[PDB]
Structures are given as C-alpha cells and as structure tokens.
RNA sequence: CUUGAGUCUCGUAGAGGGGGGUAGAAUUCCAGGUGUAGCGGUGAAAUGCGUAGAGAUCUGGAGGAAUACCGGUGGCGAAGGCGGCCCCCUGGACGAAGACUGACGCUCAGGUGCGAAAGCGUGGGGAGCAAACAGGAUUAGAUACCCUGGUAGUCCACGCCGUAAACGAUGUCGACUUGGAGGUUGUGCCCUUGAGGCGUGGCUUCCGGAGCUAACGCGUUAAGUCGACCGCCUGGGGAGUAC
C-alpha cells in the first residue's frame, strides 16, 4: 500500500525482550496482508547524546509495505510501550530491500 | 579542608565584568573572584587586565586545596577570555582542556530590543 | 566539486553516518555548500538526513551537550 | 570548541589553537548577533544590502581593473 | 567555399586543447617576456621563468617550439596557460613508462624528507615522495655522499594528488579528498605545492588532489604585517609548505610558510 | 489528488472510446468527483484556504465546461447532469 | 480544423496550505548541593537584586515560546505570507513524450472570497519580549532617547476587523524586437573516456544595446513595438476631512 521505514530504539536493559517485540510487530504487519521487505537488528549502540539519562540503546530497523491503519496502530503501541524510547516511522517511495550501510 | 588535585575553572566573561570560579570536577565551587571585586569599577573592570587580576586572585584563594591540574570552561563574550586563561596559566596550574561553553540558543527566546544611541 | 553528482546517488541516507560526518562540524553544525562545494539540490537532502540522524541520536546536535 | 592539551604541547600554542577553533565556530559573532532583537525586515535588508555590496565589489571593480591606474 | 568549412574542420583536426602539440614558434624575446603563436586567437605573454633550464639562463631563441596549455579562454585580452605545465605531462609519461617494464630508470638524488619521504628531483623539476620511497631498505641516504647519484625506483605514488616517493641507491634491487583527510595531517607534514592566486590576504597554495590551502599573510616570512605576499614569494610556483592545521569539516586546511 | 485507478474508471464510464479522456463530459465528471472528494476534506479543515482556492477553481472550470456543453449540444448536457446529479 | 484553452500517462523540486505528534539548544521559575561578597547595569551613574547567602557553579523538576548550523539577491505561494524533524489530509507549478477534447478563450462594473501588524469579543495559556505604568538617570525641562522593573499584547481555539511604503510605489492576458554573465529546477543526445561536451524547456538575479523616458532610469521578467479588457488622475491647501 505505502512503503514505510521504521527505526525504533529499545532501552538497553530490555535487549533480551527485543526479538519477541520484533516478532509481534511483524505479526501485526502480516495480519493486514502487509509485506516486510527488510528487518535489521542493529543491536546495542552508543548514543550520540544521552536520551532519558542512558548512554546506549538497542536499534531495530524495519521496512514494511503495509496499510496506514496498521502503521498508526504500531505507532500507538510504541508510544505507550516504555521499553521503546524513540521511534521514527518514515515513509519511502520504493521497497528498498538492499541492506543498510552500517550493517555492511 | 580536603585537598583536591584536579578541578575546573569556570570563566564567566561578560561585557561589563569577568567572574572566575574554581570548582572541583563534580561541580562544587572551591573559590571565586571577580574583576569588580579586585578593585576595578565601571570602565576599569570591563578590561582584560582586570579579568587577569581576578583570575590571579581566584588562583590565590584556591591555594589551600592544592590544585595542580585544571580544565578551563570559558563562557560569554568579553575581554576577560584569553587574558584570564593566560593569568591562570601563569599562576601555575597544568591547563588540561580549554572548552568554550557560551550558551547559544537554537533560536529560542526573543532577545531584548535594540538600543537607540 | 560535488560528491553526490559523481557518485550519482538517488537519495542521501541518514543511516550512512560516516558520509554525514564529513559534512558536519567539529562543533556538530552542518557545513556550508560554499565550503564543501555540494550541489544545492543535494545539500538540502544532506541537511535533512543530518537532522534525521540527530533525532535518532546517531549524530550529535552539538559537541557540548550531554 | 572542546580542546585537549597534547602531551608536551606549549600553553601558548594550545591557547592559539583554542582561539582558532572559536573563530571557526563563529561563537562570538553568534553571541553578538543574538544580543538584541533584529526585526525581520532589518535582517532581510542587511542580507540583501550585503549581497548587493558583494556583487558591486566583484564586477564593477573587475571592470575597473582592466584599465591601468597610471 | 566549403573550402573554408573543410579548412575549419581540418584546422580543428590539426590542433587539440592541452599543451600537447608543440606548435608555438617563439616570435619575440625580450626580458622578461617570451611570446609564441600556437595557432590561437592571440600571442602568449610567457614568463621567462617557464623557460630557463636548471641553472638560470635561457635555452630557446627565435623559431623554437614548445606547446603551452589551454581550456581557459580570454581574461580580457590574451591566450594561454603556461607551457611549463606542458612538461608535467611529459614527466607523467616517463613515470607511466615504468608500468610497461615495471622499472622507470633515470637518476634520482634524494637528500632529505620535508614530510617523511626524501625529495627526488628529475631534470629541472624536484618532487617530494613519502618517507619509505627514498631507500629500498633502512639504508638511509644521510650517510651517503650528499645529494648522491642513483636513479629513483618508485616506492609510492598517490595517483590523484601528485606526490611520488622514489628508491635511491641499491641498483641490484628490482567526497574524494575529504573522507580520509589524515594522510598529510599529523602536525607538520611538509608539502611541495604550486601557488595559484594571492588575494592580498593570502597566497592559495593548493596541490594535493583537489584541496585548498592558504598560508594567509601572518607567517609567509619573518615580518608580520607590512609584507604584501605578491612581493615576497611569487605567482605560480612550487614551494616549501606544510599543513599546521586541518579541519576536514569546513575544508579549511590552513598551511604555513614560516617554517 | 484523484487516484489513478479512479480517474481511469471515470474516463471509461463517461468517455465513448475509453482512450479519449479529454471529452468535455468526461472532464466534467472528473472535476465533479474531485469536488466531492474535497468536500469531506473541507468539512474537517475549514481554515485550509489555499487548498480551497484550488477547489473553487476546479468548480469554476466545471461550470465553464457545462456552459460550453449547453450551447453546443443540449441533450448531452442534460444527460450528463442527470448522471452526475448537478442541479445546474 | 488544431496552433489558443483544457483533460489523461509517468516523473520532478519545493519554508505551498490544514491537522496531529515529537526533538534538541537556550531563557525563566521552583527544590536542593557547593560556596562567599558582591552582582547587575551605563558614556558615567543610580534605581534594582544580594550575608534572610545573591551573582557564580552543579543536580533534579516545571512550563512556555521559537526553531542556531543548513540558509543562498535559494525555494514555494494569487497576494498577504510560509523555515527543526516525523506522519496523516490537501492545492498548485514544471518537464517528458504521446493520446484526446475541439475555441471550450481573454478581461471584468456590480458581486463573492482570501487579506501583515496592531486592535476587538469569548474561552484557554503566559517562559521570553514589552505599548501603558513605576522608579533611576540625562537635561534648562525630558510626560523621550539610556538603565531597572513591568501589565495589556505577543502564543492557542473559534469569531470579528478589512487596513499597511498591502511596493517592482509598475493592473491582467496575448504577440513581436540585438546581447552577456549567473542562480535554480527539469529533460534529450554524447566515448559521463572526469568534476564534463552539445542542446532544449520552466522560474529567477545582475549588467547592458536599439528604442523609450523630464531626467533618473527601463531595457525579451520593458518603462520598447502593438492589440483586448478593466481600474484610476485633472493645480496646491481645505481633505481622503464634513454631511
């Protein structure tokens, strides 16, 4: 429908919970016949500045071709979920399946 | 008083008056001195020389703490900026870092109106 | 002497942090298109990318802040 | 303009470096600019005026240069 | 008729833009100005200093032919960029010749490293190379008789920015500038750079593969303020300069010359 | 704007050839649909003045088209206005 | 009938608009730590804040407003105007080829809408700034300029107001007439042999030719050469006032 690109940052103490969260997110996307073109756990990462007093955080990239309702839902979930510190759902023109420059 | 080897020198350099404050690395102020305090008033205290002497005074004040290493944090625009640090150096601390810490907003609050002179 | 024209990139990536780092200051600021000689079209894109990065704490807003 | 004195570096040199850094930053200039509120109009005017001046310097002067002074 | 059209495409065919075709005949000499005519719209105001070879005196009388250069047209009145650069292409060709047999042999004599590689000079020109290139091993030409005769065996060349470090003695043995701007960095790496234009505050020596250096007015000499850089150095000349400072961000490498 | 598929559909219905697209009637239909779409938007966003300008322009264009149709060929116009439900 | 006008296809750049989120810097205040006599301010002072612990300095919190750098005689918009980042809804512009419609056009008195800032109404908000006001200076006086404070207001919602040097002091639309140097945004070909080479469109900054102009100047974005429609002027004041 519309090709979004999502990057969310999880609190580093909840790093072991991340995979489950990712799975959940994927599931929702799948539900509305939404494809998920790339998905990249960047892992624990040093922040350029300390958001909410903490210096590292766990970054997950995820590209999705989904309807906007589901995106909205995801956003809502993120906002209420306290594990995820920041998110940045961000539209894109194409599917962009090729890997990110920091993974490579 | 507990002696401390390393600390910070905060140099608040305004247009009208320089204020030097030596503190420990954590934030707790040890001593301070000012150009206005050093026996300079109006025209005189807004000068590099005044700033230098303030710095010197400050240094003298934190003799008992036994401070060898010193990092400098320079704030604001003024004459007392280069001069002050030179003075500090002379007074005989190993200057470790020289940082600028002027508060620059990223366009935030409206400044006061322009003077008509 | 623009890099992005020669490389022939379709869009500048905020994730490509290293690249961004060449166009950002020691103090964190975005470097002018006079100095870098970046093309105008690309410059804006680059700026946007940098901004995005800053939001994601990939790049710093400034050197002092903590 | 964060700086660290290198091992066996002179004080004066360090100071100079710091100064240079500051200059590069344009921190003082920035401070000066934000001392007082500039009306948008005024800001616009300065920018355009400055531009005009620059243009004048570039082209008219170049034209003058072609002809010798003595 | 189409005689002229054909003659035009003929004359297009029998010239090219760079200093390649040795065509300008020296048709007036006067100190200090040479002048040619390579089939261009006007005659070059040549310096005398693009044409004296290795000891200071002139080499070419009337009728003699060197190509110059091009791609820059009309600054008001006149035609060229200098033929001496011409020469650089010839030097490049000889350096390239190495590739064929994996060994360019001339003479290289390198006494010392301005910036970590002995300086080698070939014919009139002298070039700077990275520190390893001067010696095959750890031999070091400091113990060799000064300004000794070998050849140059190439150690390293930078391929964009022109720095070539070459192999003295040991005959038996046989975007782009700004990401990795850490090569000439570390505090004081001396460079050999041609100055370009002196802007009354500066001199603008800039050679190392698409960068910009200044050497502004404060150093330049051992007098500060009364100096006026046009009096004190040159126009278009390869000099002693090193970095003293790099900002890889606001591309201002601030070189010096008082060293 | 109007989605491509929707536009195509509109063209097919009103246009005689279906490749035509520029038929007056077809154009009118296209305009009308757009207007309808924008009504919803403008109910929500009453201060979106700039956007509303475009809508107004579109409406004007439609009106003009209708007028043109009327003088040329009355029956067709009548048919069109029955189809779309344009009061005039 | 297809050259004007419009529709469709694919892209393009954009501070165009409306709505909802969020980020970081800085100011202010609150609470607490450290610390000690000044701070602040000016031409120079004083009022003012300070030993009831200010200023400085560090930690934590609150809240509002605006968005450094990018940033440009750059961009978009009918004008007014529009500037962090993200999403949702949404208007226009331009190019590339085709395909279609077939004069459907231009202008517009009345009419309708949009229309900076200040201002008004009701309800919120209120950090900074600041008409009014107060004090301190300056001065012959100072109902000002300068200083210290400071309330409407600025901010948001929904209404009204309908004006500005609302300016390019230049109505809109179309056609035609030598050139140069740029900027920006497409696009065709070319060995992109490289940041290039040769074109071709849109918008745009400066200089200047003919011509025009009282001159200043304008000059393919005309103030030139013409056509279509509208608006407006008829000495200065009285007056854009009175009724």
φ, ψ (nearest 5 deg) of residue B82: -80, -45
Resolution stated for this PDB structure, in Å: 7.0
Does the nearest atom of strand G lie within 7 Å of F23's Cβ?
yes
Do chains C and E touch, with touching meaning 3 or more CB–CB pairs less than 8 Å apart?
yes
Q: C34 — contact with chain B (CB < 8 Å)?
A: no
Break chain A down into helix, strand, coil percent, rounded to 5.
30, 45, 25
Break chain F down into helix, strand, coil percent, rounded to 5.
75, 0, 25
Q: Give residues with Cβ within 8 angstroms of E216, minimum separation 6.
A: E201, E202, E203, E254
Chain C, residues 44-63, CB within 8 A of chain B, namely 61
Q: Could B114 and D27 be called an inter-chain contact, meaning their C-beta atoms sit closer than 8 Å?
A: no
Contacts of C among chains (3+ CB pairs under 8 A): A, B, D, E
A85-104 residues near strand G (Cβ < 7 Å): 86, 88-91, 93
Rounded Cα gap, residues D25 and E141, in angstroms: 45
Q: Dihedral of the CA atoms E147, E153, E157, E161 (nearest 10)?
A: 40
Helix and strand numbers (H, E) in chain B are 2, 5
Residues of D within 8 A of B86 (CB-CB) are 15
In this structure, the number of other CB atoms found within 10 A of the CB of residue B90 comes to 13
Does the nearest atom of strand G lie within 7 Å of F27's Cβ?
yes
Q: Give residues with Cβ within 8 angstroms of A1, minimum separation 6.
A: A34, A65, A66, A67, A68
Give the nearest chain C residue to B105 (CA atoms). Answer: C62
Contacts of B among chains (3+ CB pairs under 8 A): C, D
Contacts of A among chains (3+ CB pairs under 8 A): C
Q: Could D1 and C25 be called an inter-chain contact, meaning their C-beta atoms sit closer than 8 Å?
A: no
B50-79 residues near strand G (Cβ < 7 Å): 73, 75
Q: Which domain holds residue B11?
A: 2-117
Task: Return the closest nucleotide (C1') to the Cα of F71.
Answer: G104
DSSP 8-class letter at F50:
H
Tell me if B25 sits within 8 A of B44, measured CB to CB: no
Does the nearest atom of strand G lie within 7 Å of B28's Cβ?
yes
Rounded Cα gap, residues D11 and F52, in angstroms: 67
Residues of D within 8 A of E245 (CB-CB) are 20
Domain ranges of chain D: 1-56
Q: D24 — contact with chain B (CB < 8 Å)?
A: no
Helices B48-61 and B82-91, interaxial angle, to 10°?
40
Rounded Cα gap, residues B52 and B48, in angstroms: 6
Kindly list the distances between the CA atom of residue B30 and the CA atoms of B20, B25, B76, B80, B90, in Å, as whole numbers in the listed order.
11, 10, 21, 20, 19
Domain ranges of chain C: 1-65
β-pairing, A2-10 with B6-13? unpaired
Kindly list the distances between the CA atom of residue E144 and the CA atoms of C1, E137, E208, in Å, as whole numbers in the listed order.
45, 14, 30
Helices F24-44 and F49-72, interaxial angle, to 10°?
150
End-to-end Cα separation, chain C, in angstroms:
35
Tell me if E202 sits within 8 A of E172, measured CB to CB: no
Residues of C within 8 A of A101 (CB-CB) are 13, 15-19
Task: Return the closest nucleotide (C1') to the Cα of F73.
Answer: G104
Q: What's the CA B116/C1' G139 distance, rounded, in angstroms?
A: 18
Q: Give residues with Cβ within 8 angstroms of F12, minimum separation 6.
A: F18
Q: How many domains does chain B have?
A: 1
A8-37 residues near strand G (Cβ < 7 Å): none
């Amino acid at each position: 429908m519309r090709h979004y690109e999502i990057v969310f940052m999880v609190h580093p103490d909840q790093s072991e919970q991340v995979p489950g969260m990712i799975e959940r997110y994927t599931a929702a996307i799948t539900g509305a016949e939404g494809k998920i073109h790339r998905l990249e756990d960047w892992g624990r990462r040093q922040l350029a500045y300390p958001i909410n007093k903490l210096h590292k955080a766990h970054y997950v990239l995820m590209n999705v071709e989904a309807p906007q309702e589901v995106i909205d839902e995801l956003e809502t979930t993120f906002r209420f979920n306290d594990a995820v510190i920041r998110s940045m759902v961000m539209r894109t023109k194409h599917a962009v399946t090729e890997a990110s420059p920091m993974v490579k | 008083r507990k002696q401390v080897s390393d600390g910070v020198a905060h140099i608040h350099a305004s247009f009208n008056n320089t204020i030097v404050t030596i503190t420990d690395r954590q934030g707790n102020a040890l001593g301070w001195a000012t150009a206005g305090g050093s026996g300079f008033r109006g025209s005189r205290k807004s000068t590099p020389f005044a700033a230098q002497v303030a710095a010197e005074r400050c240094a003298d004040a934190v003799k008992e703490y036994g401070i060898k290493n010193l990092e400098v944090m320079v704030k604001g625009p003024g004459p007392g900026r280069e001069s002050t640090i030179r003075a500090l150096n002379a007074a005989g601390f190993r200057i470790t870092n020289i940082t600028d810490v002027t508060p620059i907003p990223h366009n935030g609050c409206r400044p006061p109106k322009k003077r008509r002179v | 002497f623009c890099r992005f024209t020669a490389e022939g990139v379709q869009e500048i990536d905020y994730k490509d942090i290293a690249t961004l780092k060449n166009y950002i200051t020691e103090s964190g600021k975005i470097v002018p298109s006079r100095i870098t000689g970046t093309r105008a079209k690309y410059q804006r894109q680059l700026a946007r990318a940098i901004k995005r990065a800053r939001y994601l704490s990939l790049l710093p807003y400034t050197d002092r802040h903590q | 303009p964060v700086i660290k004195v290198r091992e066996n570096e002179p004080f004066d040199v360090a100071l100079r470096r710091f100064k240079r850094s500051c200059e590069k930053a344009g921190v003082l200039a920035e401070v000066r600019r934000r001392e007082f509120y500039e009306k948008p109009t005024t800001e616009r005017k300065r920018a355009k005026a400055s531009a005009v001046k620059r243009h004048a310097k570039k082209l008219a002067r170049e034209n003058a240069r072609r002809t010798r002074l003595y | 008729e189409s005689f002229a059209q054909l003659f035009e495409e003929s004359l297009k065919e029998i010239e090219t833009r760079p200093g390649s075709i040795v065509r300008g005949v020296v048709v007036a000499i006067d100190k200090d100005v040479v002048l040619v005519d390579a089939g261009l719209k006007s005659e070059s105001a040549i310096p005398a200093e693009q044409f004296k070879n290795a000891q200071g005196e002139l080499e070419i009388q009337v009728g003699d032919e060197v190509d110059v250069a091009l791609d820059a047209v009309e600054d008001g009145f006149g035609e060229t960029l200098l033929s001496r650069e011409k020469a650089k292409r010839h030097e490049a060709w000889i350096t390239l010749e190495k590739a064929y047999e994996d060994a360019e042999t001339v003479t290289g004599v390198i006494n010392g490293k301005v910036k970590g590689g002995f300086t080698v000079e070939l014919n009139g020109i002298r070039a700077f190379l990275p520190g390893s290139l001067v010696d095959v091993r750890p031999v070091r030409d400091t113990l060799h008789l000064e300004g000794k005769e070998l050849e140059f065996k190439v150690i390293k060349l930078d391929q964009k920015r022109n720095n070539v470090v070459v192999s003295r003695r040991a005959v038996i043995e046989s975007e782009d500038p700004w990401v990795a701007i850490a090569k000439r960095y570390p505090e004081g790496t001396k460079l050999t750079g041609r100055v370009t234009n002196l802007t009354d505050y500066g001199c603008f020596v800039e050679i190392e593969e698409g960068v910009e250096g200044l050497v502004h007015v404060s150093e330049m000499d051992w007098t500060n303020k009364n100096i006026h850089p046009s009096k004190v150095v040159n126009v278009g000349d390869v000099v002693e300069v090193m970095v003293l400072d790099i900002d890889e961000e606001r591309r201002r490498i601030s070189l010096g010359l008082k060293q | 704007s109007l989605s491509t598929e929707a536009t195509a559909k509109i063209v097919s219905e009103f246009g005689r050839d279906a490749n035509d697209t520029g038929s007056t009637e077809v154009q009118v239909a296209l305009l009308t649909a757009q207007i309808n779409h924008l009504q919803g938007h403008f109910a929500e966003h009453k201060k979106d003045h700039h956007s509303r300008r475009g809508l107004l322009r579109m409406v004007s264009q439609r009106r003009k088209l209708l007028d043109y149709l009327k003088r040329k060929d009355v029956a067709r116009y009548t048919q069109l206005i029955e189809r779309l439900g344009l009061r005039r």
